[PDB]
Symmetry: C3
Subunit: 145 residues, 3 copies
Amino acid sequence: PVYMVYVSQDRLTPSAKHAVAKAITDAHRGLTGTQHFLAQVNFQEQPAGNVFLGGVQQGGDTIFVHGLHREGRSADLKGQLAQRIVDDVSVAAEIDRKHIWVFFGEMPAQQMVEYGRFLPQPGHEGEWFDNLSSDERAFMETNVD
Amino acid sequence: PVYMVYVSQDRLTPSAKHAVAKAITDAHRGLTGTQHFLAQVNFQEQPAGNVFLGGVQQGGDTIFVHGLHREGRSADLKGQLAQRIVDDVSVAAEIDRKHIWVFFGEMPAQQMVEYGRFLPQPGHEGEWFDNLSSDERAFMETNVD
Amino acid sequence: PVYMVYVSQDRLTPSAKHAVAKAITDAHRGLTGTQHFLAQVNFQEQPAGNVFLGGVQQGGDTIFVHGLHREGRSADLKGQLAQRIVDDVSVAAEIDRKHIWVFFGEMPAQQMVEYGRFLPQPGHEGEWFDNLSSDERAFMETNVD
């Protein structure tokens, strides 16, 4: 999964990004079982006053999370991935919930690539990791937190 | 909805961005009936040079609009929406049409959170608005023009 | 198509962006038959340290290629397209493939606008260009490389 996190500039300190991007990652891993290193959190920063809202220019206190998952998960599961991400990013960012937008897109894994490899079905994963090369699995083990 | 509006840095003043948001949001409100505070417009600036049509580098003149909607609307309606957004962003930002690009992807409202709440269907949004805690309803009332 | 290309600030020199946009552009034209000029490469640059993998802040060495396409093409072709993007970008940017992430989404051509016109299916690619207005065609032609 790729999570695009849109935020106004200098709202999250370099430690506020780490805490939020960890909250997201633990949320995913716990709920779906996809390994930590498979999650990516990509903060898109823009100078504040670029988020309009019913024509109303906003400050720099709005966060939009765009997830990109592969298909195969129930709506039940996705509603729970979404609310936990509302609840935990509120904490790690220290921001009220009313400012959080969370959208999820889904795609067939067969047109989804991470670490230069095609992904497996959400009902796979453990097997897929082992049968990758040694150096590929080593580089993956580096990105855990 | 969220509209991601990809614009070259230096193309829109503060006044031009509000003109663009107001046209986008009004167009979305008038063809779907979505109440105003639900249509976010999210400006994303990159330095001129970062856009390559056909492998050719571009100046600050291209606008890519990326709308994210709940599923459920007709193609006819969506073709109207996509044709209005073209004409009204051409006006508000003094641009011409053949520089304007617009893509709509849609998602189950079950996996769309706004203001900390799950989007309903197009067949509900008024019943939805009414049964929110006083704070939620009131915060949304501010973000309307 | 429209490809968003998320990369770190300074990672790609301008000559590098051109080479990579040209790799992707050659990929799409080569395997889908879509004329060069309908292929946009929109580079989205951020400071190094906004990209997190497995909750760990990365250097500036991550690429994320997100392709927005017409619905229509075989899973098999979309695999190859994504594969040839992976290989060609690895080579144009001078970067390992385990740094490259590729997701394709798809939408109805009916909800897709490039140059202010509605895209056709993958089913009238050539006769479509034959009914633009000459000035729009002449505009099309400057974006071949």
